[PDB]
Design a protein around this ligand. Structure first.
Ligand code: MG
Ligand code: MG
Ligand code: MG
Ligand code: MG
Lengths: 719, 719, 360
């Protein structure tokens, strides 16, 4: 629900269980009053006013020294109000002046959910959602700012976006543009963020917010491996199952900045949006710029509920793929299995092997195009290497189909190698600075996807390939960060170009399952999930590391979105050995699939694959649609444990991987969550019956281990 | 000492107890090798190289994927190298390209200590110091960067500054310019910063450095009350008396940014320098820009030694005032005593009162000029109000001299009120944006001190006033933050103008004691201490709060620099009552002085003033020149306790203020520091004798309290 | 409503060095009999209470001169002294009976509505392995006999304050003197800790004079009042030394406590802050129907340019609307529990507040 009280100039946004409230003050400033548990009260009483030294006053406040935007909580604070905190907006006007001082002009409440020009965004129908659009302006800056709030009641989600219009005659530049700001007049908080590196993404870091700023972001041209564009502000003491917490999630696959600051008056400001670095975005007279969307959510009852709200929002209101509500083929991917050393014949052998085990699809990964026999050439040359494939791609697809198998293929359309026909023809199509030798990464360069001519060339090549046969799946990879950034519009316009290509591809091939990828989870974001129902979660396929990566990824993203494959051991990234069973349990927390040559496996491991596939298919709907619960913290605990629970709470699958081993082992219990306390549940394998209360308070004792890194799955059915 | 090894291209800086080392690598990049305990080793072995996903490579690295400035430790990292971490330098070139990719060109080692154009900086003689100047350049950016390192061996100080030259034909802008970067390849750290507000400055915040950035800064045009331009990076576990810690202190009174970041590879980068916000500094062809100086220091033996190194550096190599080595008059200040409600007669009465108590000087604070009978008019109108003073300023000074008293006066030259003759004549002299009504703070505006004509007008007025008689002391105040910033050069050029005026003033009046002020400690920085031997530490004169403010201030700044006065109770800022004795003990940790009307005091409190002055004068050299030790943490402990120890360790003064009170009190011991373990010390009042070892390990028991907030001073003399 | 004549009324008890065990009224000191004193107090419209310490004996007493072996001691060993007194061996019926009879004579002199039973040292010189347990059986036997003989008596337990603040004593006494520390600021901590197990109604708490006799600290009369209302309430000072303004505060305090007495004593208690760590000591009581609440706050920390401090309430109905009495402002329970209310800015140290809320 969205309500306006014209007398108090208060806007209230209600979800099923939350309330967000803002007010236009007598000077025209849009103040933030409240976000938290549902209330019908007017929360303007929380505002207080004192003469605070060096916190100065708008001219319009006259002699009232107690009114300062350096103290008051705001919806969209800006550089140019006298506020000295981190700010959401900085405009450099047509005379070089950095100032924006925004006053209320008008509003509209609309049924349904706004869409964003050229960008992914949350979507919903006119019954499920409402939109508030508030117009603010600064007549000296000659800017008009449209704040967009999307309210999805059942999901307990409030989205925010911004459109900025130049209303003057000369060009302005947008120098900083956040999508969302939360100002808290009180509270002690921790900041949860998800940091990592290539092949070890999204480790949880949780620290108290001390005085000053905790900040993180990306200027890599991508959302990044290093810091995901996501933040949780948890009230001190909040746990998985109790206490207030707030999320912001950026629906965006490019650069970003997140800032959380505890100020001089013990107030907290949380910002998320575009990075101000390499962002000086020109806006001509009368033109509008759109800031990508942030999904906000609040939980009064801990982190697990907050995550569940995000999972549901992403599955049902971000992902547009038909595969959200369909079985997804269990695939085998050629990359760890063969790297570049394959032929058409060895792809068909992989299909034969995989077919005999119950695998549904073979994915021919990197190495099939140009003269790509290593990673030093051929990106941009998306012509099938028929020498290597021993014939045409059409013939290969048919040979695979004849083994009863679907076919998928890898592409990397944003990239070019110096050693390519494309680069020899068009060296100026690479992102570079004139006169400067560019950074190389994986011995390749980015194509300038801000340029239509560049995108069109590559799009046409990819269409020729995809039109050769029935290709049910594409893995779209992206294997380096952007450098040599030549202008202040490039980072943003590059990503517009990526999304344009992706939209064109998905529209042309609406039955295609598109798996996003960027050296693993280098663009693991809701922007990509708008197009792809799954993203390769990490290049690290070590089961033990995957417990951490998948744990961290679950704070915002649904299990269904996490690409996860059983791979060979010793693991190619770590050298560690894990049992085949443990690899299977860990990879079932995601898409499932395989990425190895099954011909090298023992007959016992081949039979495990057969049984694994049967297990995953049996539980696929539960894993993908069920309510997810983290049952342990793999950074600190003896086990990595999680579970999925059906909507009716009549079925649950519990997964456990042991992380630590000593002699004379203590008994370890796994405590379940999300069941009906008074219901009786049958554990399938053992045939024992337990109340939900018992399972949640005492849990179940794990069988004693006899080897390292042992794993378990337990299924429960309500009687 | 400064050494160059041409074969390894290694530069080593040695202080008495520390070593800092850097290397020019085979591609020309200036890498940071080491900073820590003294060593003659070549520390280049610490550098390691791996192919790290998405950490890309200079073109010049060829096919070597293991070489990345996104991983390697650097002296002066920049935007445009492929480094994705926070960076020290961003240049926007004459074509709009944000890039700087700096390669070694040349160096020089010089005896003595470099000076900075228009800026305060550490100074020393040619025997005490050496300077290393390294020249780097980027031929595409057409920029040349001169890194300056100053080595003060005895002080264990290394300073850093930067000069940036435009070597091309078109204008460039400097968009970010740090003065110092420390890159650590390993280590777990905490970040100590000093945060607050008007009337409560420099609270200590110490938190672990989690993944991501901890950042703080000022865009107030001033160093600020909110965050001091100072940082300590302490290795985890470092205490007052053990463990590694690193300081950076900005010798600058304007805007700044500090960033500490723990990265994807568990490395730490620490930056301090100018703020990138409201900083787009134009540099024409052939012109040079100077970044203000950072003073670095390292201690292997805890925070107390680090602070002592800073205290000594500031007293002996920053402050130029003759009063560093002279008795300073004990003053009484009219502000809390009378506010604006005084006449010449009541200033002379204050002189009479103060003279009878042993006070040396009366300071006529705000209210003497224009028609300044409140804070709503007259800034800019620096003409004596002879109606209010009942005659001329010359006559008033003489009347005060006739009471045996010196005279001081308050000024606020950077400011203007709309209600002033100056503003009616020159409204365009205020900092403002054309067409925009400006922020007001304390109902005043800043004068544009970037303009010579503006400064000259005010300087001439102040000279007329100071030339009326023997004025031994000036308090130069500054009572609001900068807003309505109209161009990207203003923040920096404003401060150049302030320093120019301050230099002119100090040169014209070389016997003047100039006390810096900015609503208390709003510009409590080493930049100001170059001109002023003391700065009004806070407008908060509550003794209990002052224990915290003075504690925090001591981490970098010497006691001698802290303006501190005994004021009346109930305290004007807090309403709290404290004993006269406790106010006295607390204010003696600084300049000492009074700020009350002694005519309102009891005869017993007047006699306390007489005895306080005798005590302060007896211990003045010890307090000002002695080695300072924090003996407790007033945020956590039962007491605020500190001490000063003579250089020979033959004399010590210990001060204690109790902070907590309960019934049936436990015995509290104060443990001393910095004495000779085997020496025998006589405690003066009691006549008891103790070894230094006893005093440092067991300490001394405090007498039981009988009232709240009781204070103590103990003097020890070596036998 | 009542005056309690505390220690000093018996034997020749003119200090704490004699007379425990000699529970005969000092009629010289009282200027007449206890019966006459009670009547004189009744004539002022006041009830009467009295202090006793039946478990104890001083060497300087008639009882000890007659029966030195009645003290707990080890044969041949000089005993520990504490407050210059000894324990009586309450494991012995003959000892208990002697003292019980003396106390009955005193309590039978008039209408005594209240007894404060104190106990001012720890047991030492323990002579056998049954003594600690049997001593306490003897205490409980005496206490049961006393309460049965005098079933209308309000018995306040005491042991140098809260030295036996336990549910065993609360079986007999509806309140226990919570601490000899009557400093309001310290009492915030003591009362906080005591609330983890024990109801507010059980906590003896009095407004006392300043500078406080135990700490030397000064607190406002209002702050002392707010803190002592988290308990029994009462006074322990000479009101003749107070200003007329403080006397009028007492009148208003009593009216306030009596107005909220049922709510404070029977209402659901909530700790709203931790006085060891937080800026305030804050608590509240809420009626069973959640239609009435009293919120109390004592500020603990003071600095310049104060930040706004909010008190977040607990235990209300989220959707109900509550009227704050003094201000007349209305809030939902949800608002009051999630955002709370901003405290008025302080102008002096250790300021206190009470807010009353009524469901509309
Ligand atoms: Mg920008
Ligand atoms: Mg930033
Ligand atoms: Mg800049
Ligand atoms: Mg910044």
């Amino acid at each position: 629900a969205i309500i306006y009280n014209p007398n108090k100039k208060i806007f209230t946004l209600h979800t099923a269980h939350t309330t967000y409230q803002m007010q236009v003050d007598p000077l025209g400033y849009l103040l933030h009053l409240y976000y938290g548990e549902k209330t019908n009260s007017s929360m303007d009483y929380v505002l207080t006013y004192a003469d605070r030294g060096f916190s100065g006053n708008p001219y319009a406040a006259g002699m009232d020294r107690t009114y300062s935007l350096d103290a008051l909580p705001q919806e969209y604070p800006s550089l140019g109000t006298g506020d000295y905190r981190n700010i959401a907006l900085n405009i450099k006007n047509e005379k070089g002046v950095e100032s924006a001082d925004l006053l209320f002009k008008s509003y509209e409440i609309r049924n349904g959910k706004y869409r964003l020009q050229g960008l992914p965004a949350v979507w919903a129908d006119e019954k499920e959602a409402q939109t508030l659009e508030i117009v603010l302006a600064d007549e000296n800056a000659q800017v008009e700012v449209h704040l967009l709030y999307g309210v999805l009641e059942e999901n307990d989600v409030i989205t925010r976006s911004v459109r900025i219009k130049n209303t003057g005659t000369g060009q302005i530049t947008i120098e900083k543009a956040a999508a969302a700001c939360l100002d808290f007049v009180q509270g002690e908080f921790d900041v949860l963020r998800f940091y990592g590196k290539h092949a070890m993404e999204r480790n949880l870091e949780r620290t108290p917010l001390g005085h000053g700023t905790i900040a993180f972001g990306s200027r890599r041209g991508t959302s990044s491996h290093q810091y995901n564009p996501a933040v949780i502000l948890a009230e001190k003491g909040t746990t998985e199952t109790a206490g207030s917490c707030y999320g912001m999630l950026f629906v965006y696959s490019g650069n970003f900045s997140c800032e959380a600051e505890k100020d001089q008056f013990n107030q907290t400001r949380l910002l998320l949006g575009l990075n101000e670095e390499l962002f000086s975005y020109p806006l001509a007279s009368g033109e509008t710029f759109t800031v990508p969307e942030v999904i906000l959510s609040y939980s009064a009852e801990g982190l697990s509920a907050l995550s569940q709200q995000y999972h549901n929002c992403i599955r049902n209101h971000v992902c547009r793929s038909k595969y959200v509500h369909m079985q997804r083929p269990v695939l085998i991917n050629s990359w760890e299995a063969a790297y570049f050393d394959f032929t058409g014949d060895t792809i068909v052998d992989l299909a034969k092997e995989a077919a005999s085990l119950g695998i549904d699809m073979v994915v021919m990964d990197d190495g099939w195009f140009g003269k790509r026999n290593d990673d030093n050439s051929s990106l941009g040359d998306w012509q099938v290497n028929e020498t290597k494939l021993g014939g045409s791609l059409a013939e290969l697809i048919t040979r695979v189909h004849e083994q009863g198998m679907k076919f998928g293929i890898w592409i990397e359309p944003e990239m070019i190698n110096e050693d390519s026909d494309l680069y020899r023809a068009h060296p100026d199509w690479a992102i570079r600075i004139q006169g400067k030798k560019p950074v190389r990464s994986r011995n390749q360069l980015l194509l300038d996807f801000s340029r239509k001519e560049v995108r069109d060339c590559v799009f046409d090549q990819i269409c020729v390939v995809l039109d050769q046969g029935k290709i049910d799946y594409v893995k779209w990879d992206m294997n380096r960060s952007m450098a040599d950034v030549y202008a202040g519009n490039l980072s943003y316009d590059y990503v517009l170009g990526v999304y344009d290509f992706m939209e064109r591809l998905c529209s042309r091939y609406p039955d295609l399952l598109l798996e996003g990828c960027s050296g693993g989870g280098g663009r693991f974001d809701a922007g990509m999930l708008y197009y792809s129902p799954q993203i390769w979660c990490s290049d690290n396929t070590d089961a033990i590391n995957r417990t951490r990566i998948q744990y961290g990824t679950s704070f915002f993203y649904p299990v269904s979105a996490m690409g996860a494959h059983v791979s060979a051991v010793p693991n190619h990234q770590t050298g560690r050995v894990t049992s085949f069973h443990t690899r299977g349990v860990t990879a079932m927390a995601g898409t499932f699939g395989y990425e190895l040559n099954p011909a090298l496996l023992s007959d016992e491991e081949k039979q495990q694959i057969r049984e694994q596939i049967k297990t995953y298919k049996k539980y696929e709907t539960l894993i993908n649609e069920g309510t997810y619960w983290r049952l342990s913290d793999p950074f600190t605990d003896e086990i990595a444990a999680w579970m999925s629970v059906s909507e009716e709470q009549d079925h649950a699958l519990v997964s456990v991987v042991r992380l630590m081993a000593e002699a004379n082992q203590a008994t370890v219990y796994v405590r379940l969550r999300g069941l009906k306390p008074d219901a009786v549940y049958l554990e399938e394998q053992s045939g024992r019956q337990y109340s939900g209360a018992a399972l949640m308070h005492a849990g179940i004792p794990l069988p004693p281990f006899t080897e390292e890194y042992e794993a378990y799955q337990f299924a429960f059915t309500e009687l």
